[PDB]
Amino acid sequence: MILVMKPYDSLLFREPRPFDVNNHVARTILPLPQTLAGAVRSAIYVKYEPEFEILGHFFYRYDGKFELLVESPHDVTQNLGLVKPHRIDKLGITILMDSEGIKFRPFNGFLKFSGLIDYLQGRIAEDSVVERQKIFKKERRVGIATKEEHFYQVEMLRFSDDCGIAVWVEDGVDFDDEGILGVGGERRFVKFEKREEPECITNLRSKWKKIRDKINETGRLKIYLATPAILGAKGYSSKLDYDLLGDIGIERVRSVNFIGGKPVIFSGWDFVTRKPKPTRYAVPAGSVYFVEFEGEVKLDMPYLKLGKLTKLGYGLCFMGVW
Amino acid sequence: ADNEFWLNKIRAFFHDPPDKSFELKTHERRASFILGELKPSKSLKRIIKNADIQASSLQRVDLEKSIHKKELKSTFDRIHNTEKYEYIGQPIIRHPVTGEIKEYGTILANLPQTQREVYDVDDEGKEDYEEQFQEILSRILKIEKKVFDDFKNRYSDPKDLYISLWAFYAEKLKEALEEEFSASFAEEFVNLPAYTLSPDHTLFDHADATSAIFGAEIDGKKPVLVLFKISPVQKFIADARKEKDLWAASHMLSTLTFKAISFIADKFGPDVVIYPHLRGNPFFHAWLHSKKIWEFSDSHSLKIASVPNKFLALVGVSDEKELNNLREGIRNEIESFLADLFDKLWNEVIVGALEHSDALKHLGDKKEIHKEILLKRFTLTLSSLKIHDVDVSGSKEEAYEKVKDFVRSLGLPNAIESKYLQWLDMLGSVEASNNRPTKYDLYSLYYEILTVLNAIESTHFDKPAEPAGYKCTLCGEHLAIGGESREMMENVWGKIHKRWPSHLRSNERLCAVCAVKRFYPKFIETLDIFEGVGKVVPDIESVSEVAMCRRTKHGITWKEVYDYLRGLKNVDDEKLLGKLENLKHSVQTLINNVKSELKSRKVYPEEFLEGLNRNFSNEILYSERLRDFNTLLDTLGFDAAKLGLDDVKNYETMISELRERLSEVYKMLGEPPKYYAILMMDGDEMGKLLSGEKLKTAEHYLHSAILERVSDALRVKAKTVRRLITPAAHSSISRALKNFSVNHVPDVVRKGNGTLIYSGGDDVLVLLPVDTAFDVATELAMTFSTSWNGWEMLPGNKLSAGLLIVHYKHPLYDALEKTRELLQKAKKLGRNAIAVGLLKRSGSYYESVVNFETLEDAKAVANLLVKEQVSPRIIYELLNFADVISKEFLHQLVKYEAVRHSIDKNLAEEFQSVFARGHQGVRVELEGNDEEINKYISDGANLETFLDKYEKAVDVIRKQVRGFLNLVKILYESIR
Amino acid sequence: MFEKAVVFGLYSITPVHAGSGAELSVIALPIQRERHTGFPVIWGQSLKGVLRSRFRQLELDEKIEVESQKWKWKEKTKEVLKEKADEFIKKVEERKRDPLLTEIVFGPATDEHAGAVSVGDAKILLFPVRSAKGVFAFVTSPIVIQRLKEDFELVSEIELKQILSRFKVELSNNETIAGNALILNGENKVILEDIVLKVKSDSNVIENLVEVLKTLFGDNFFGKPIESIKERIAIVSDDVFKSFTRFSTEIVARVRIDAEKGTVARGGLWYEEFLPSDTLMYSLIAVGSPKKENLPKEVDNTQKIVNVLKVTFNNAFLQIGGDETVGKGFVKVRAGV
């Protein structure tokens, strides 16, 4: 069940840097899955790692047709060209290839679920991508408030009038449909709504077998991070543990190639102990893992949960071919 | 053993005599003579020559074999009988990047005035010229022998002698020659090229490249290219509170990467690293002083972080395990330095503050986790690309075909694959049986693939799982020291603040990284390359200090009078000496009262409170800060509420008298400036330049008058094939970058009254007052764009710049991030453009992305504005009309506004001219993904005609005029 | 959180200059404007700062009558806290704290828990533009109706719910839907400050908009008859509406005069922009159950904590912005009953 959350006003999600009296400038980051997970936990508690699992969260735009927007993959150049890693046996090294030069800049933006059903194959259309400005803007409120120095700057997320945030929740765990809850930093709220699972999901769910068998026959698999994941075993590391892919039935891995941005540093407030939660590092959303697996994948779903805190919404990954 | 290896490196360095271009016929014997008893063997000379030819100048070593009816020559002896040589002309030098051609003036003046251009073997009228040439060559050889003999006598160890020669042989020889012949003679002589048939790099750069190649291939070691990156940088730099944290972060990052560089250099050799060019680097000089090789000369200031965060080196590894050992050694050296700093902090500022408290035992078990958190903060990425040994055996055509087939087997995209195929064809277009391809022919391709690998392999991170607790208050991401419990953390940090109030504050609870960075300045006098250099930490504390560096209307800066207040630097001018003495006495009496009151509380060390006469915060010169006693105490860094002095009110007389004296000073010294300028600059498409795309065709880099005499096929090839850089050319490029980033930016920054923080290679980061920010920005841009200043190389490329003018009260992290955003926007919009932004204390934001020459005319109109020659209202009307204006009546409307708002007709005409000229260069951000328009604007061309051809010129011109008025408003606010 | 919500309304009696903007295009201090749309807006952070202060000063004078019974804060804190409540009284009178009941409603002071209410941004609903006939007009945009359509569904929702879905109108850049008092007689056209607009015939869109206003702001309309307003709505296109808000606001030049010479001082000249009077703003107020800290018996649930806020603020007159001393900021508020 999707959870549409249309913001009445702008939203600010606190970055880890403190802001009480000294660091008056308070920037914003993209909504971490923990914040939305806590908001949904409050919502279900009012209606009646949590016992229920949140698959993840994606942006959406409602202009006649209702479509969910997924973070732009790191596998797409700014010229809408895919990047594929091919290995050079002569030099013994593997490089990422865009067929137009060894250097490229990832395309910042989004990718609709129609894009997802076509991007997993290995091609991307033009209409499948949306720029960042079409969804949200960085609205910075200034001079909000012996108070001569209390004037502090705040940057918020100014979503477009037809754009909001949708949270993906597994079937069941039903609760209140229409209502309002607070999300973010400085006290703001959204007008959330409960909507049946979109036809895009079933479009990608039904066509999962084709991509799955293509991956199985070609011996190549790509894993796309829809939401950030904490893949460390003891600490926090970006290296993909080979046992992690052993759950889906990978007998052996030949080579693993991963491209991603700077890690996201975050923490939380432990309401039970009234102390901040341990700091964590997660691989940024939109990163893709290129693996050369031996064997086959027996996963019945086109997605899997990787890492810890997967119930919140972390580690939403899609299996794709390259 | 290792001594033999060092001696072999010395031999490889001097296989070409420094005066080789004077007479190519007997260069090898001259090199063997200058090497003295250290002269090479036979087979060792052969392998050294093979390494030299396989090294760079392959666009010359595969070109010097020109057999066009003779062997082409270009020397100074000009006795090369034409029966077999048919020389071209006098030697020249060409810039490795811009191909700018410079002749040799002073070297020809000392040469005999020959009556003919060419001379044969045994013609008449030759004996006198030959005798004169022999005399001058003997003098040069004697000077070189004296210099090298002194170097050999001073140093006994082969490694010490090798490094000393590599570092100072050129300088010492140049000094000796300028003592003997003339300064310009030595300057020209020391810049002679190695291969005269294509003088695109200096002889010594070729010698360094030859030494690096020979060391890479020696003893069966397979040469490998290694690139190292220590990341992240910008996020670590930004986490600062005062200017000292930012300086400490920059210097610490530079020190770590230079520790890795020094490990590599002491393992293999100083020349094995191509970027940065270590010669002449102040950090390299400090390292040499540490190794007891050469005493630090104090000529170059060490307070500047003059080492980039990446280095590229050419080393030879026996196997993969050797490379892994090298990587582990680099990582362990960096981690050892970090752990040494952490232990120093933990045992000098934490134990020394909790010497007896039970809290020390509570956090004693947390030393390991915080040490490991600090160690695992940065990411050290080492990427190595093994240099393929292309099979060059067989015929020349067969060898070139094999090399090209190997190139084609990589599957590279057609663009750079075609580029390298064209390069190989142009190399193989020469007519010579002995011509053969070399392994380093595709050195550019190896460098590009290595850069891609490093950019990919540096995205991998592995970081620990820190426990719970309240995070650090400065960085915000790491658990604070002793932050397990709020009460324990507050107690510990209050004790530390009481112990160290000059650095910390009443509400700071730092983590390992932030605390180490904060206490970094007080430790570095006891770290490896230091304690013998002197005054590494700069005498600038707060960001407001650099704002005060702006000079007032009486030829005197607020910073200078502040330094006079502490008594550091007396003021020479006596017209204001009495008022300055009155203000100094008032502030001294007030701080004496404050420190006497504080000593009663017995909460701070007496030594710290004794020095408050000298280290009091300069923000007290702001009349706003003196509104009462609590704010005055907070300005100095003391919390009145914590000390309980929030109720003291017997000092109001002193504060009022100080405020009156401050107003009296303001009467003619002007109010103290509250705005400073952050300027960070970057190299424009340096990767493309090193990839060969931005380089020009081989015709420019060759000798000018040899294109015609050569065979037609390779003539047209060099006409329409772009040159690709190579070890010696790369070394020359890095040498020009070092020359700029070391000898030029610090000088113009000091002349510009700014404070340079980091000048590593292409990048530059300075903090300057709003007075000289734009002037120094334009000066630095023109310096970088220059190709040959005097007799020293210069990068000859472009910079995008981001300049931010922000209030001193603004937090440092947000200002730095905004300046980085400005730089990124400048790069996004047709680079070689400066992005100027203004962030007022209220929070209003201005914007302008203009060409570097647009500043001067904008400065002129702003100067007209401040001088009351033109009313400021003309700006408001022009902004109002900028929305509804078109190119046809641009000039007429501007002329009407000028003649309306000016004083006379000439001022109005000048305003019209400067507005018309300046507003052409302004970058625009259209709705569509249009970079061609910005590219046209970036140079100055038929863009005006192209604008007529352009389909949305009205939006372009409207954005241009609006941006020009915005930037001129920024300038007017800055001056006023 | 925020179980229910209430709708507030604002009406600028005098021009309002609240906050500033990071744009700073021409005017030195523009008004707070939305980023994506560019409409004028009153941020919920600054709107709360005047809602809470006005609520606070009522406590010091005890005019917060709850359920038709006057509120006495001095005894209430002692009744519900005791022990240190006497010290709590001293701290509040020391200006280091705030009265008890306000902190349940508007959150604690600088020196726990959170406020039971949240103040949303005040989005514009009607903008005044000079006209030829019908001297001034209340102009809207179709998406402004769309914004009001969704927000009003949180409180009212059922007759208004059905009529809310009827708000769907497409308008070209020159057509308009206007009241009878604005249409030029004979020539079916409307002129709104140099712009000529053609009236589009309709009989529901203007009536529907004034229908929800009466049901959410009473029969009276901020001291004016409701029927006198229905004839002066002029719905225009989004581009026209967006352009009006950028350029139809009052830009006021200001300067300081020195008595020593009688002229103006050098550099003491700047221009500030004011929101026009007769600007019907509206802000959604989100209210939740307050934190249980032994609260008085009159503020237990959310329904009781919203009635006090609505009653104490209906027909109020508070000042917004930083020009109080020059008669700028006074706005009449009408809480949605």
Ligand SMILES: Nc1ncnc2c1ncn2[C@@H]1O[C@H](COP(=O)(O)OP(=O)(O)OP(=O)(O)O)[C@@H](O)[C@H]1O
């Ligand atoms: N000592 C230093 N002081 C200040 N700035 C530095 C220093 N060393 C490097 N920099 C600059 O800081 C920036 C950080 O570069 P970095 O290696 O982190 O990659 P990047 O291009 O910023 O992006 P990415 O993080 O995606 O790799 C660069 O612009 C670099 O030139």
Ligand SMILES: Nc1ncnc2c1ncn2[C@@H]1O[C@H](COP(=O)(O)OP(=O)(O)OP(=O)(O)O)[C@@H](O)[C@H]1O
């Ligand atoms: N001579 C050199 N040799 C090797 N590396 C160099 C040299 N000069 C600069 N570099 C490094 O090469 C890298 C270039 O990457 P960077 O992201 O800065 O792009 P660029 O080519 O400088 O231009 P742009 O920023 O406009 O894309 C930087 O890390 C810089 O320090």
Ligand SMILES: [Mg+2]
């Ligand atoms: Mg660069």
Ligand SMILES: [Zn+2]
């Ligand atoms: Zn920290």
